[PDB]
DNA sequence: TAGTCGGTTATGTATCTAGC
DNA sequence: GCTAGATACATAACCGACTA
């Protein structure tokens, strides 16, 4: 029973299997349901194809709906449960793979996959393939081999093309695709027959109390304060992303630390509170909007205290404003004329209770559409959730009663057969198609946005278009006149307008030797070996014992990031490391790299860095040191570093381990005994040549007396300590 | 007691080192830290202002001393193309590079380099357990292969490391966890001779 | 009429997802009537319950649990002329259940219970 | 045995892909009307926001802009 | 709140014991 | 004489706990 398709979306499944192309849906209009529909298409053992951009959730839920859809040859997950030897075998049987990056990168540089038969490749959240990730690496490998498959990319979020970083025709270069297909909310097929199928829907605007709104407007006076200081300081944070209006989102977050991050080295100091005191305005903005009064207090006592004691919200706290805003909320809690209390609670649980009461009362002469139908209440995250549930439980009174006095100073079975509400907390950032997949398990005749977002009303559009003949109703529940109001505006605008940008965009854009480096296999979490592997260096991933690039056959380079370096120099690894690469190795090389979003800046006492490493390079005299701003410098010196020299090879990397042999000229002993000499207490740097040279191998050190010990080494101390450590018992 | 070439008079680094003596003498190396431990300097504007100067340095140095560190200053605000050259020359003409972004990193670096000509290595090894039982399971450890489970099994069965030593490759055999990989590996460590033959 | 409804365990109620299989080409739905509905929990009584014990002794010793009964091993059933297919897979959502006909808090158990049922001969 | 991903042609896979399709397309579902829900109390007692999420209506810009957040 | 240290996590690979 | 499963470890990137 194969899915049936909307009447708009036939359309779209004709044009994409016509021919490759990225596809781009309005917020919320189903993805997964496009994504599901190939998957079900291409479920045959006769062919392979592969899906990239898939959280672990999104998997199991289609591979149960194809289950339960009764389906053969389910699609698999491949994971580090199938070891590399045991991996072949899944790819050659055919259908849908549900595989990792890093497990597909090392399959398809190690030639470990069926490459001449891979049929095609489905990308999921097509707006994350930009230049230098994972899936454009492995993307561009399967191309370079196949040629031959298809490349289907499909994306919600129009919006993030909208941004000044990320370009539309990049990622459709990037994707190797060239067509794109705009399938917004208002266009005519879509738009036509979504409204013949119209949920009923009611929505609530409730209005908050004298307090409410005056706490609300000294929050954001201040705000419009900060934003104007900090924007004077720094006269190119000028362009309008950072608004005041566009600076009460919850996306505001990542682009401030796009625009400071850079010039973080050199930044001020207060410009580095004003940052913080905006994050904490949006914090307490959110605060007031979402949780009861009690917390409010708390959390503005908190801040009290600690600027008491750190001084840490200077800037505010003492204004008038601010003044303003705590008389406000001690006024909302406390009553002076040895205390009295007054607890208000904010509209929004009574206009809830109110539309419960209307719920009931329906419900009690519900027998038309069969039984009563159940409530989803869909809150804004889980403090709510259980707020909500310990409100309706208890009442307005207990419940604010017992949050003051705790917060400050005081039948077995059957069916149920009722009408159930169910509060689901809907977490719009982390997975937004989840309110679907609860709208399946538990279908409701109700349901009540308690906290609302774009995605949640096209996808209750979409759940009801779904189903011809059920109805259903949804209340909405907003505060007129707040933040939430504007947020829900600006997110209407900036997709309408991204959209028009999209398909003016589309519409002007309609007019027009080999050489080799051997890599190790854990460095592939890393950007440096697809940007060597761009530059036309093929790659031959191997399991290294020494060093991670072997660029020639004499010379092993091992890299080492800042962070790394300081704590590889305070642990102990980089001694070991150093001396085993110039053991084996004629030329070693340690490469310090830096990050480019970071200072190129490496920042008398042992404890410096500058110390250890020049003690380390003292000591390691043929020791080399390169120094690279950023893993794009890096590849181009791998290139320049290797010009005239021979390819390594593998095979003989591989087998430079412990039981090999070293360099002709490296060391006059062996390297066995002479670790395990070293190690054992009683013998220093300097003695250890003495014993090595007067004696053969352990045994004869062990049957040696303390007189010719002692004679040997020149020290009572060491010589006793030795016969004390070779001659002692585990039992003594 | 460095012997500074009077070549770099005109160095704003001579007023930063401070904490050790150091005199004019006519050297071919810039900074003579002491024997077997050279210097040269290079402030990167000056290298690009004359691509020359310092490939004549190094081709005229010679090949006398067995450290020559060649420290520079990086004062431009694009200096990935002459560090990627600079890189090239230096492992190309056998001296080590060091980056110091500023008069007092450089300073330091000679000072540091000049005052630890015989200090031990002591500083970067790793802090290793002074417990007897520790100590034993992690020199029994530096075989390959070899963990430290095994390693207790070994303790308990023989307790003394002299017929540790004494039992032969079959008898450390027999014990349970320990098959003929590292039978071979710490027979062959206990019973090889120090110098290499 | 089907659809999916809600069985109570001491403390708890699962939310089983209840499935219908067509009549061949031509679907429907009608047969599976009221009085088909309930007397199948109890076909499905003790498997339910043993899953509301384990649960408990896992949740009191302080580590995960793990399916021991899931798609890869489903629970075929036998009853009067349909079939019977069971699962126990895992959420991931933390919903919270109140009755409101007594207001009052009901646990869910925080795995999805999807049976599948059809038509026999 | 070697597995199908071998031995079966490409053509026929490319005319197994078109017969499944050309089945997918058909499936074509029912059409009831839907039964009317009670009216609400609370309606009695404007749904511009959830109406403007079309998208399609005029909404001039100062529509997008609330008055007490100036 | 931001720098620093330490634990956790995902993939691989020898190596031994039990069973063939 | 030949093969399957399980223990210990290696390693780099990432997240949380501390802490100033
Ligand atoms: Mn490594
Ligand atoms: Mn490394």
């Known amino acids: 029973a194969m899915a049936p398709l909307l009447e708009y979306e036939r359309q779209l499944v004709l044009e994409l299997l016509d021919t490759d192309g990225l596809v781009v849906c309005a917020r919320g209009l189903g993805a997964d349901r496009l994504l599901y529909h190939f998957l079900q298409l291409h479920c045959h053992p006769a062919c392979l194809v592969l899906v990239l951009n898939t959280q672990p959730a999104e998997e199991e839920y289609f591979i149960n709906q194809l289950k339960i859809e009764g389906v053969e040859h389910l699609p698999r997950r491949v994971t580090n449960e199938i070891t590399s030897n045991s991996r072949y075998e899944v790819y050659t049987q055919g259908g849908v793979i549900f595989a990792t990056s890093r497990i597909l990168v090392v399959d398809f540089l190690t030639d470990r996959i069926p490459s001449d038969l891979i049929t095609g490749i489905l990308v999921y959240r097509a707006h994350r393939i930009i230049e230098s990730c994972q899936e454009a690496f492995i993307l561009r490998l399967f191309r370079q081999k196949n040629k031959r498959g298809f490349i289907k990319a499909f994306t919600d979020n129009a919006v993030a093309f909208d941004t000044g970083f990320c370009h539309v025709e990049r990622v459709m270069r990037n994707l190797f695709v060239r067509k794109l297909y705009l399938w917004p909310r208002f266009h005519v097929a879509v738009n036509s027959f979504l409204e013949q199928h119209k949920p009923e829907v009611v929505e609530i605007h409730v209005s908050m109390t004298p307090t409410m709104l005056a ?344 890299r080492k990031s800042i962070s790394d370096l300081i704590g590889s120099l305070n642990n102990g690894r980089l001694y070991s490391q150093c001396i085993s690469m110039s053991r084996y190795y004629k030329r070693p090389v340690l490469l310090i790299e830096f990050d480019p979003s970071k200072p190129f800046s490496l920042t008398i006492s042992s404890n410096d860095i500058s110390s250890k490493l020049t003690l380390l390079t003292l000591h390691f005299p043929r020791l080399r040191i390169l120094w690279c701003p950023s893993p794009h410098a890096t590849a181009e010196l791998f290139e320049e570093l290797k010009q005239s020299k021979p390819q390594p090879d593998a095979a003989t990397a591989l087998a430079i381990t412990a039981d090999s042999e070293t360099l002709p000229e490296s060391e006059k002993y062996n390297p066995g005994p002479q670790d395990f000499l070293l190690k054992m207490p009683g013998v220093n740097a300097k003695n250890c040549r003495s014993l090595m040279h007067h004696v053969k191998n352990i045994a004869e050190l062990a049957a040696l007396s303390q007189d010719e010990l002692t004679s040997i080494l020149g020290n009572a101390a060491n010589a006793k300590q030795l016969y004390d450590f070779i001659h002692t018992s585990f039992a003594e | 007691s460095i012997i500074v070439s009077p070549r770099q008079r005109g160095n704003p680094v001579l007023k930063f080192v401070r904490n050790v003596p150091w005199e004019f003498g006519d050297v071919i190396p810039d900074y003579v830290l002491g024997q077997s431990t050279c210097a040269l300097f290079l402030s990167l504007r000056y290298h690009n202002l004359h691509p020359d100067y310092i490939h004549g340095r190094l081709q005229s140095l010679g090949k006398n001393f067995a450290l020559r560190v060649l420290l520079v200053q990086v004062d431009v605000k694009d200096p990935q193309q002459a560090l990627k050259e600079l890189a090239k020359m230096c492992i190309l003409a056998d001296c080590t590079l060091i980056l110091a972004w500023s008069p007092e990193e450089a300073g330091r670096y000679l000072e540091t380099y000049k005052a630890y000509e015989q200090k031990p290595a002591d500083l970067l090894m790793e802090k290793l357990e002074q417990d007897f039982v520790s100590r034993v399971t992690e020199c029994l450890t530096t075989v390959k292969s070899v963990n430290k489970t095994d390693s207790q099994t070994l303790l308990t069965t023989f307790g003394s490391l002299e017929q540790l030593i004494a039992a032969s490759r079959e008898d450390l055999a027999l014990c349970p966890g320990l098959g003929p990989q590292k039978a071979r590996r710490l027979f062959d460590v206990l019973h090889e001779p120090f110098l290499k033959v | 009429a089907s659809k999916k409804f809600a069985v109570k365990c001491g403390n708890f109620a699962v939310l089983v997802d209840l499935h219908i299989l067509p009549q061949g080409s031509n679907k429907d739905t009608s047969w599976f009537s009221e009085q088909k509905k309930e007397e199948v929990c109890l076909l ?78 | 045995s070697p597995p199908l991903l071998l031995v079966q042609d490409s053509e026929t896979t490319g005319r197994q892909i078109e017969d499944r399709v050309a089945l997918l397309l058909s499936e074509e579902v029912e059409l009831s009307s839907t039964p009317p829900l009670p009216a609400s109390r609370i309606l009695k007692e404007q749904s511009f926001l959830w109406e403007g999420s079309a998208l399609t209506g005029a909404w001039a810009m100062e529509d997008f802009y609330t008055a007490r957040l100036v």
């Open chain 3, 44 to 121: 499905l009584k003790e498997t339910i319950d043993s899953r509301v014990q384990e649960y408990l002794e896992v949740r009191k010793q302080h580590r995960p649990s793990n399916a021991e009964f899931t798609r890869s091993n489903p629970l075929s059933l036998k009853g009067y002329g349909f079939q019977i297919t069971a699962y126990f897979l895992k959420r991931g959502i933390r919903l919270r259940c109140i009755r409101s006909t007594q207001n009052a808090e009901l646990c869910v158990f925080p795995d999805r219970f999807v049976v599948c049922v059809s038509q026999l001969a």
């Open chain 1, 215 to 558: 706490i609300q407007t000294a929050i954001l006076d201040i705000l419009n304060a900060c934003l104007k200081e900090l924007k004077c300081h720094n006269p190119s944070l000028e362009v309008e992303d950072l608004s005041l209006e566009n600076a009460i989102g919850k996306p505001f977050d990542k682009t401030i630390r796009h625009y400071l991050d850079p010039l973080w080295h050199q930044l001020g100091a207060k410009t580095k509170s004003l940052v913080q005191d905006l994050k904490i305005l949006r914090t307490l903005l959110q605060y007031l909007s979402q949780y009861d009064c009690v917390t409010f207090l708390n959390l503005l006592e908190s801040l009290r205290a600690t600027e008491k004691a750190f001084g840490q919200n200077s800037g505010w706290l003492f204004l008038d404003s601010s003044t303003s805003m705590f008389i406000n909320a001690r006024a909302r809690v406390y009553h002076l004329p040895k205390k009295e209390l007054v607890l208000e609670s904010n509209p929004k649980w009574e206009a809830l209770t109110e539309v419960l009461k209307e719920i009931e009362a329906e419900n009690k002469e519900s027998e038309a559409l069969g039984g009563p139908g159940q409530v989803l209440i869909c809150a804004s995250d889980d403090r709510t959730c259980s707020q909500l549930r310990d409100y309706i439980t208890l009442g307005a009174e207990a419940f604010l009663l017992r949050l003051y006095r705790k917060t400050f100073e005081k039948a077995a079975f059957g069916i149920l057969k009722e009408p159930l509400t169910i509060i689901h907390p809907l977490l719009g950032c982390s997975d937004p198609y989840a309110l679907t997949r609860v709208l399946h398990e538990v279908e409701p005749r109700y349901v009540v946005l308690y906290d609302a977002e774009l995605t949640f009303v096209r996808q209750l559009e979409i759940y009801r278009a779904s189903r011809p003949g059920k109805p259903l109703r949804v209340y909405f529940l907003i505060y007129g006149g707040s933040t939430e109001e504007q947020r829900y505006l600006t997110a209407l605008r900036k997709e309408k307008e991204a959209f028009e940008k999209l398909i003016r965009e589309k519409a002007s854009m309609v007019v027009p030797t080999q050489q080799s480096i051997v890599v190790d296999m854990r460095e592939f979490r890393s950007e440096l070996p697809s940007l060597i592997h761009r530059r036309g260096i093929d790659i031959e991933p191997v399991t290294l014992e020494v060093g991670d690039y072997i660029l020639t056959p004499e010379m092993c380079v091992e």
